Write a protein that binds this ligand. Structure first.
Ligand SMILES: CC1(C)CNC(=O)c2sc(N)nc2C1
Ligand SMILES: [Cl-]
Length: 130
């Protein structure tokens, strides 16, 4: 219905806002663009499901997220990919893992505080009815 299209549009507006606040954070600059296969040739082979904040933005506009759960799945994916690909004890790896976890935590914290549970519930029930 027209009412349901309004709900998903509100969701997309909310998700764009959250993602923008993550993307401008200097700690998360590394997660703002896809991995360059030139600088990093073995990434695409090791990480089967690449994800970054620019791709998240693209998926929002393509109406790929009907719930915040769908959205958070991709956020978690950005984090889990970073932990998997950079697992060593060296400072370089430990820094990006720390930043990855901070990205995940920040996203969840923003949503915990600003997302209405009834709004999310409505999104889920509309989604489950399709
Ligand atoms: C450090 C880098 C070159 C490779 N290792 C990574 O974890 C990622 S994930 C991403 N979106 N960019 C990079 C850049
Ligand atoms: Cl909301």
């Amino acid at each position: 219905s027209m009412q349901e299209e309004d709900t998903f549009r509100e969701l997309r507006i909310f998700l764009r806002n959250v993602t923008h606040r993550l993307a401008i954070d200097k700690r998360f600059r590394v997660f703002t663009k896809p991995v360059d296969p030139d600088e990093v040739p073995d990434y695409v082979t090791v990480i089967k499901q690449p994800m970054d904040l620019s791709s998240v933005i693209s998926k929002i506009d393509l109406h790929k997220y009907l719930t915040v759960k769908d959205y958070l799945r991709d956020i978690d994916l950005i984090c889990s990919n970073a932990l998997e690909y950079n697992p060593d004890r060296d400072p370089g790896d430990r820094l990006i893992r720390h930043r990855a976890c901070a990205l995940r935590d920040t996203a969840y914290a923003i949503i915990k505080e600003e997302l209405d549970e009834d709004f999310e519930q409505l999104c889920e029930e509309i989604q489950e009815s399709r």
